[PDB]
Each structure stands twice: as structure tokens, then as C-alpha cells.
Symmetry: D2
Subunit: 115 residues, 4 copies
Amino acid sequence: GITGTWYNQLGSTFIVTAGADGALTGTYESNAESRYVLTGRYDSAPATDGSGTALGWTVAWKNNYRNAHSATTWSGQYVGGAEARINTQWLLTSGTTEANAFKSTLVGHDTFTKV
Amino acid sequence: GITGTWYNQLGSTFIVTAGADGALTGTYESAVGNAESRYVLTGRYDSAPATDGSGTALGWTVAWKNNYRNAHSATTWSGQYVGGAEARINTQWLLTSGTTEANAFKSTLVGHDTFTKVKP
Amino acid sequence: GITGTWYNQLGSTFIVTAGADGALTGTYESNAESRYVLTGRYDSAPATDGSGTALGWTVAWKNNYRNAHSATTWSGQYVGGAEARINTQWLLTSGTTEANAFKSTLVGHDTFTKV
Amino acid sequence: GITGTWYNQLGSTFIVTAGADGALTGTYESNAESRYVLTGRYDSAPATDGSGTALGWTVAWKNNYRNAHSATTWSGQYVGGAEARINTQWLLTSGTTEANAFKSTLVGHDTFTKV
């Protein structure tokens, strides 16, 4: 159920392939200037008790056209079914000097759907 | 640089290779939790950091499943590498477990890790 | 604005009083055994540009009937408007031995509405 | 054991009184320009098995001299002993417009000592 195209509410889009041995590979877009490589991992043998599938992935926001000197990680779970969704929490860290490290990391949450 | 063997404050080991293309590949062995042996890791880093003394942003994921066991969970580390006298990588991390919908509210642990090239 | 009775996504009720110089006082429930004291602070002089009102509160999960040996803090902002809402992120810390400190804190998010 | 003056390792000072009712009251200094009111809660009946004591507190960064339109919540635990410490994770939320509301919260950590 994970392989495919996913959308959040802010428009953004991500296309992933969930390989056989837990790999997650794909791209994240918000045009070419807006596409970034993603890579992650997921639990390739989840429970069957009704639990979701744990996964995670990272995007460093540099492509051949841009560099924000930052990286986001999303940690969450795939919830299959008719309203399949991926519920995540994320951390965005920015390259900062030591003096400003205390405010280098933003936290938030995102839900992705197939629609 | 980032490539090498790193240790966190708890004795966990992170062996990583920083590719040319912003890719991070390696292995992680955790000292704590529902873990055993090495786990595959993958991530990304900024391969063209700023000059001003800023650190290098990076992140990576481990799904806690190998041939020995499966914890049904995954951890993502988000942070930055700071080179120099004592090189170090400072991170914040999110550990998400597979749960049913009713317990999704308690599925995610949050913490911070410091990695260094010398074992503590 | 902030003063009154609020509800989250899950059926918990939060009754607050917002005081003239930034105190937040009240109770958090989910009967009496599920009733706990909260306290916090808010920006008593927000921006007039459209931004929300920053706030936070804490609940320790001890009352006369129960003690879970833990505390939750909510960090967020009130938004006045169509549906007045409080959007938050929370941290729940459990008292642990230092061997288990790594697993002591959960993170999540909640949205409160007067409905 | 919590009542007292506490220092983090970046020049900040927390003076707190822990009340018999589970209340935390005090001052956070980062000068009188730099003094802010804090309020929180803690477990007034913790375990005596070596587990720490859960607590939290909030500072809204408004005083009579300045206003950052922001608030920090600290979630953590007190650990007694020779080298007593309070280990925390915090959330700093800023007042933002609706569209910037995703970049509104910073996450970090703090350790305080009686030094």
C-alpha cells in the first residue's frame, strides 16, 4: 500500500517505492527546482493485529538548483485501508553556528493521503 | 569528516559513509532498547554546506527490523555535524512504534543524542 | 477569548481562565477521578497583524485519586476567528530510572475547539 | 528538593518554589529586563525506587519591558542525589499567521544543575 504518490494538505507531494527489504526511495516535490531526493526505511513485516506500519524518511533540501542548508526527517506510520494515510511527526534541522544551535530544530506533524 | 565510526552517549555505534550525492549509508547498533546486532541505516546530508562556520545538516532512519528480531518501529535522527577539535554530531530523534488507532497518541518517543568519534 | 471550555479531538475537556497578566488557571478532565489541576501562561499582549496568541500549560497527573508519576506540557497558540482554536504540541514525561531515561518522553499534538 | 536556584549551561537562571500542592512558582532570568514569570506543576508524591520526579513549567516571554510573542514549555524530570539535576525537553512556540503556522515551534533540550 505504501508504494505510490502521496499528498499532504499544503499541496506538497511525494512519490515512493517501498522495496522488498525495507528500503524507501523516491522524490519530494512542492517543477524541477522544487524536487528533492528522499530516502528512508520501513518495517517490511509489520504485525497483523491491526497495528500500523512504522516507517521514516529524510529529505536534505539541496538539489542542483537550490540549497537551504537544512534537512527534514519524518517519523510515523502507514495506516492502510480505504482512507489509507501516513501519519507523521517531523523534525527540521538547520545548519547553524554553535551560538545559535538552540534554535536550529523545528518540530511539527504531517498527514499524507493517496487523494 | 562525517564518514567514519561514531558513538553516542549510551555506547551505540553508528557506522556511516557519506556519499558524493548527499547520500548517507551505513549500519547502527543500539546499546539500548529492543535491539540486537546491526541495523541498516539510510539518510541524506547537505553536501555543500555554508562557509560561515555553520554546521552541516543531516538526517537518517533506522527501521528496527533485522534477521534476529523486529521491534515494529523506526527512529529518525535530525541534526548537524560540527567539525573541528572534537568533531561531533548533535541530533534530536523521533521513535515511532506501530500501534492501533486507539493508541496512536502514544506511538512516538522523542529524545536527543550526541555522537562523537571517541567511545565514551 | 482563551477563557472558557475547550475540547480536543479525543474527548478530553479543558476549562481555563485567562488572567489579566498572563496567568492560565483551570482543570483538565477526561468524573472527579479524571480531574487534574493545570497551570500556565499566555501572551497577554499579542500582535495585531493576524498572528495567534502564544501559550503553554502543564498538568502533572496526580490528583487525590490517581498518580501516574508523569507530567504533560502543551505548547501552542490560540487563534481567534471563524472556528476559534488552540493548536498545540505536547511532551509527556514519565518519572523513570536513569537507565530508562531514553524512553521517558512522548511527543504529540492536539487541537482544541469550543465545540 | 526542587525548591531553589538552578542553572543551565548557557547562562540562564531559574528560581523556583515547589509548593505542597504540586505547584511550581518562580522566576526565569536570561537584569530585570530579562526576568520572566514561570509557573508549573510537579509530582508531589513520587516513587522512592530511584525514579525521577516528573514536572513541567511554562514561561511566556512577556514582561513589562519586552515581548517576544512566544512561550516555552519545559517537560522533564528532577533527579536527586549528590549531583542533582533537572533534565528537560522543551517546546518554544511563537505567534504566527495561519500560513507560517508550520514553522512555529522549536524543539530542544536543557539540563539544569544546582551549581
